[PDB]
DNA sequence: GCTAC
DNA sequence: GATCG
DNA sequence: CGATCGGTAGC
């Protein structure tokens, strides 16, 4: 039999006993276009988001769908895409309230070329979504993903050190080996090089950030957001965790839950969703 | 598989 | 990137 | 381990 996984109930209320009074969601929707014929948005109206991420948009902003101005619970939209590549990487930050502050990209000409971080300043805390540079088949882009990775982290410790922040989205690292079903077999492949890894690890101890999910549920095994379309993985669960919601400790006293949509279809990845007491 | 996820 | 030599 | 086949969106 397969190792299977299902999410447990949202526990929608804080330690302190307070309830949630802010619901994000994230979903790397492998084309924003297709993601929208499959029936993506029927899905987010269903879970009445306050603030939707989407990665691999792959759309330009005069492309895009007409159902996005369908939305009244997510009036606020913002999208980013690459300077030259089209139909490439694109990443969008959907919300109900106007934030204060909206800019795109991490401050490096380098890195802000494909259109892969949104960052949404709001009262209380700091919102960033991103689409983290793959290292690709053959780790070609390996070398990169590293000089990402650094000017990444740099920036993000920025970010946290004037106000807490939350940074959700596709950051492309299984980070350790419960975080995907085949652990050895991809010690030399995209998402769980060692390098990758590591980078993951001391992102987390130097901006400071924690894994809201794996805080939440530190020996909960098999829960994956990432299964790809071949070979059946995903009825197999053969996944990876691949998206997260990274919160400054500063908001754990806040943090109810970090779920994982696992059933909702539309993309190789699933939705996962945060719920805050602020 | 044209590329790149 | 799961799969099989 | 490493070569191979092989889902998919969008160009
Ligand atoms: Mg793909
Ligand atoms: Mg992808
Ligand atoms: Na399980
Ligand atoms: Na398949
Ligand atoms: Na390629
Ligand atoms: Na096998």
Known sequence: ????????????????????????????????????????????KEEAPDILCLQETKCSENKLPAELQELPGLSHQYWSAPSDKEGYSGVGLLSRQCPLKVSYGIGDEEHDQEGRV?????????????????????????????????????????????????????????????????????????????????????????????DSFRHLYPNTPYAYTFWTYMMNARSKNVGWRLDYFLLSHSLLPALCDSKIRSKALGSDHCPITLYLAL
């Open 118 to 210: 949104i960052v949404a300043e709001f009262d209380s805390f700091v919102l960033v979504t991103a689409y983290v540079p793959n290292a690709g088949r053959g780790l070609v882009r390996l070398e990169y993903r590293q000089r990402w990775d650094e000017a990444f982290r740099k920036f993000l410790k920025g970010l946290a050190s004037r106000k807490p922040l939350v940074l959700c989205g596709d950051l492309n690292v299984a980070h350790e080996e419960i975080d995907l079903r085949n652990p050895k077999g991809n010690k030399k492949n995209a998402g769980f090089t060692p390098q990758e890894r590591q980078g993951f690890g001391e992102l987390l101890q130097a901006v400071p950030l924690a």
């Open 1 to 44: 039999g397969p190792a299977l996984y299902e999410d447990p109930p949202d526990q929608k209320t804080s330690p302190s006993g307070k309830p949630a009074t802010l619901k994000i969601c994230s979903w790397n929707v492998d084309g924003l276009r297709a993601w929208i014929k499959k029936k993506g948005l029927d899905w987010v």
